[model samples]
Target chain A: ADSLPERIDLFVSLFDYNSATTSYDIRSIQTDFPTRLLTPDSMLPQTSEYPLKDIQLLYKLAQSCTLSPLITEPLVFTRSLCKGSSLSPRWFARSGLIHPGGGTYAFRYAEKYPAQFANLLPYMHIQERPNAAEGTLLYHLQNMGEDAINALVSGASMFGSGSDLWLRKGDIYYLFNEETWLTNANKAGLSYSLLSADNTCFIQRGNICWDVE
Target chain B: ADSLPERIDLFVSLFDYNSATTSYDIRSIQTDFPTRLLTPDSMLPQTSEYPLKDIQLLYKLAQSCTLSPLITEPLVFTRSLCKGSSLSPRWFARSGLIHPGGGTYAFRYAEKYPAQFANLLPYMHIQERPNAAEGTLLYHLQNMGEDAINALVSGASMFGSGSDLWLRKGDIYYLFNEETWLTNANKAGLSYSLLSADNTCFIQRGNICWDVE
Candidate 1:
């Protein structure tokens, strides 16, 4: 198997490790194999375009995960996107990640990975190493709220172009940073976060947490 | 007493009714007073610039209102707005509004209307009539979420250019719509909402309400 480069700049989802192929089943928007990670047949596309019916299927799957999942629906498509002939993802829609057209799919099909796979997945930047929990990593995503923070609401977008890097692992949701940033000695490092179904951050890098009496 | 045009197209905080002056002291960004509404000297600037010290004062007053106020600090100044030199309110900051500069003041001075005055005030659209309560009006604002709603967050900004129309009354916060809308037969009608200290709409016309297990 081809080894990955130490410095890579792109978004990737750590799907599952494939012992049959002896490589991680990584996914990304880019169909071609990544230069930073080992090129394996296990690599698959995480997101794709979905028809209107498939779009509903997504929300249905997310809701079906638990009997009493989030009742308040998360998807809020734009008028422009919804009132058009061809649709594509441009802004925030829901927590976590996948794909479709008129809309895109996060994963080409649901069989690739279930909605909550992130709860059990292990992430590797350039190489495998001990890492933080999804809830802890969620703070990293919170820090990204500055990119689109609404002070009045005291919140950030959990569903956006970057959300493709996210997936529901176990019972929680996780979003990986699409762009790598400098960490140690200006080396490229990816950041992420774990979130409640409501997209609240439990990490120090979390977004708004307001209480009222 | 003065009369206002039926087609009022601007924001006006229904502050208080004064028997002493027999006029409602409505506030807005334009201190000269609004032409749509009676050109009353009672109208004071709803928003103003505050020095660094005054900025903190506004948030302090907001927190002092209730012991269980949201501990999550809401005033998030942009790096450019906070880095040095004069500050001004540009994007979303804290909700339930008033005044200052470097950051602008929503109310020129605190003693003017008090933080939670909206809890007791009734909004007038040009002429006074039967009105909806703050909580009921909050939905009108929720419908406005499309203007700035991020699909990812599935939420709209309660604090932005329009938040200046907001005020906290009793223990609740209120935001008046900055722009008039065609409510009945293309008639421009002003709108508003009652919010929690956190700015979530309890009204059916609300934003994202995600519940996680």
Candidate 2:
């Protein structure tokens, strides 16, 4: 129905796994999530107790598949960011992203670390645990548009490095999650917030990338 | 009647307005229960108030006061440091310091501005709105031990500024009337009934100073 032809064989070149990406594994998504399918040899530590590694791998693979120019025309694939969890099932949907149910992660990262999602840390969004990690995720999910998840992970990896190597160079590669960066920025502004609520406007500006589903 | 006349005199001295102090007329004891005496002159423009003159006057006055020769002997005055306003009627009977009733002035100042008091602001005593000329007086009437308060203020004044002068000196000194400081101070060994009605063990060590009613 769209501009591209739907003949299965004629478009095989576009979805061809081998020709798609040099930095990723394209096969095995049909079975386990992408991380379990093709992670060369566990180059990064599988530190998460929950099967987040698989989820991250799936997300990464999905991104590569969606972005590969080798595909003649753009195609959509259905995948899940969370598997056995159904907290905020509609988050992805509300944000216009494809998810089966409500994104259970809505309150997990959003409500739990409201400061990050709402961008009020060091000001007003008062919560006990202002989990910078969760805030960063929600921020990216909303601010980075389609590239939020990747940037979130990359920024997280830059933490505790004590250097700006991971920060943006030529590109807009933030060295840390938006929450953490904002927290640092707050120090210079003489602004103050505790683990409670915050006054940052991160979430407001971040809404551009989110799906209002 | 007191075992330590010297300490009793020091306790009484806080009530007597030193000639060195530049008095402010207390408008009125407007707020009852927990009273607030207005000092219109001292109420500089919150937007463009400069304590330059007040600061210099306070420095000179503090230097002129006789803080030395405290009643080192314990259980001397048998009184709390510069009694809190609430302690008036009863504390007056015990300490023998003249109860000037509602029309009085209070003062609280020390050379030191402990970092713990960073959130507490000025740590002076509560004051009564003495006539029009004297303005509002210091009223450190919260029931903290006089020994503790005197030690803190006198110690800070003696040690805070390097004898002559230290930069960033504050002009107005005041004791906090809020619950945060007392509650937090109780966490550190300072306590004020007028402030925090909750915990009192957590006092902020550095901001400890003498209080007067």
Candidate 3:
């Protein structure tokens, strides 16, 4: 029952949103949610530690629902949380708002709000709002002052600590400034052709990009 | 005045001693105490961080012994430490046995004692006791135990966390042992090998040799 933040962060899967082919708008999912938008710390959980196991159980439940006389379309998409995605209501009901040891889960929107799935996973291009995608946010994270950038790899620990890719969002590009900077701005668009072991920029080619200068 | 330990570890100049050959023994300079052996920490004002330009000069002094007019030598041999080797006394004198962070330095003894004057360039030599015609032991610290052996890369973090040998010694012979039994008898003699992209071991032939198995 909370009002959605005017702006929020998202960590989405690359393939689900077809990030390579399209730009997504968060406004498309505005009507789907009970409220405006949830914060990063309040997204839903999609798959349990094992998503496949849930699918198998859902198949059995679907078989029983098929035999039921009362039900019309025994919802193939379970109202409960499972592997694929969730309804914002289903996600919010399951405790999306609670902040845990790790960052907030983003599965609820992907599974529940199908249109919002596009908005959350790849990045939200809010129509007419001009909010940058997660990729730009990642660049900003790296650009949080000099020491902040250095802290990314300077300490006994690495700046981005875990395998989950900074709160487990895949398309949430780090904007690896080194990599983006390596791309010759003179040559438009992304190209690994400029990638090199020799270049001081040391571009690590990926979907998201960044640079020192 | 203080009796610390009669068995004090000395940074012996490889040139000053005779047993630095491939099949040499420690007895060569064991008798040349007081006359040749001196603590590295005592002689150099090692604490003074370089006054900018004098870094290399300080590095040279740290690597080479200041000749004793009473003993009759200008300076001793090329004292060096490979990037990663067993932590020994040489590390103590050279860097005060400090870990520069990122779990490097003491991961191996050689890394703790990098090359001096860029003469030897700090390399690895398996089945060979670094036979430097003009070399010196800069300091002496600790031994590489189970922790060092198991470290994945040279600089291991946790006490028990480490990886199997992807790369062995370059300038000195390394004694290996299996973790299960923890016996030298169960040891495998290792030589420098190519680290394939697949992370498999490929040992160099003829360079291989064994110790007290």
Candidate 4:
């Protein structure tokens, strides 16, 4: 009951159609999981605790309300300033971000070019020792907090960027989903589950801004 | 007697003081060994056959001739193109380039606030499977030959870049200097000597250009 207000607000924001634009479009999500609905008095245990049935129901509700559309094209997540060998989706979740399978993680400015996300910085920052395997980097963020995280997710609902889930607890942001987890062995012939403590892969810090296009 | 003539030329190039520049310079040697003097009639057994005494003498020659100053600053080799996991120095030499120990390799435009090295590509290229070790990529160079190798070395001589030994037989270039070989295990826990069949580290193709400063 305590989380119902924010949850309903999230649903309304996601399913509401703007008449001026004459469109209700599906949006892309940049963070790991939905945090606005997961505060201390919230019903959710963790971002990963959401059932697939519930996620699918939300997708259906938006479509029925003419507030969202199907995303046929794959979402691309390019690297920004984070430099290293590999990344762990579980680790990102540990930090409170969302990573799904089939999402592309690449260098910022490597693709989609510049002048696109001009006003933003990376959502997550990763730094580590060069050429060392199994070593980890410091993770931090700029301009990140509850309001920013809510804006990111809510913006995805309105902007037609594909949606992924993201979560945050205090200063730590965690990304959970099939994509954020390491399903197979990495370059070192080591495989880790989504939540394992082993080294993941290299993912630099990047800005999560509203997709202008 | 057979190795004497070209050896003398090497000595001369390293020791001869020029009236125009008022210097005796350490000229670039193209191949791993002095090939100009090692003809069909030459008696040298292998490129490694050069005496340590002569090598040390040449180092002294360049210093005494005022051709070279002590290089206290470390050399930096940045990545150009060909992105992937790790690097194999042997694979680089296989592509007719040299990447020695104590050399810092990184992305070409990784620094300098994005304006630096804008015209030049990276010094090394890395290609490999995304998450697996042992699966290596095919490495090669563009327009690499005796002339390029020779030019690279010669340019080092004239440009005051620190010199490293390299060799070429047809398309295969071998670098045998202590600097170029992996004397100790790398951060990946891998070790390889020059000319060893083992894979070493990622080294991209680079143009041996003069250092402007």
lDDT of each: 0.26, 0.25, 0.26, 0.25
Model 2, runs deviating above 4 Å: A1-169, A176-213, B1-30, B33-50, B66-213
User: Mind sharing the TM-score for model 1?
Assistant: 0.19
Query: Residue by residue across B39-150, what tens digits does model 2's lDDT show?
Result: 2222222222323443343334434542122221111221222231122333322431211121211222111323323222221223322222322233322322333233
Model 4: CA > 4 A from native? A1-47, A62-213, B1-53, B58-213
Q: lDDT of model 4 at residue A174?
A: 33
Residues A1-213 of candidate 3 have per-residue lDDT tens digits of 011111111111122333222221223323333221222222332243325544455456644643232221223234233445344444434443221212223332343455665445323212212344554433333233333233322221212211111211232223223322223211222111121111122111111111122
Q: Candidate 1, residues B2-106: lDDT per residue as tens digits?
A: 112222212122233121111111232123222212221113332332244444654565555321222122233222223322322322123222222211232
How do the residues A1-213 of candidate 2 rate in per-residue lDDT, one tens digit apiece? 121122212222222233211111112211222222112122232333225544455456545643332221111222222232232333333332211111222323344444445432212111222333633422222333222223223332221122111232222333333354344433332121111011111111101100011
Per-residue C-alpha lDDT of model 4 across residues A7-50, encoded as one tens digit per residue: 32443233212222122121212242233221221222223644
Better of 3 and 4 by lDDT: 3
DockQ, candidate 1, comes to 0.01
Clash count per candidate: 67, 83, 37, 63
* lDDT tens digits, residue span A16-88, model 1: 3121111111233122212212221113322232245554654565545421232122233222223332222
Each prediction's DockQ?
A: 0.01, 0.01, 0.01, 0.01
Better of 1 and 3 by TM-score: 3
TM-score of 3: 0.23
What is the Cα-based lDDT of residue A41 in candidate 1?
14
Highest-scoring model, TM-score: 3
Which of the two, 1 or 4, has more lDDT?
A: 1
Q: How far is candidate 1 from the true structure (C-alpha RMSD, Å)?
A: 22.5
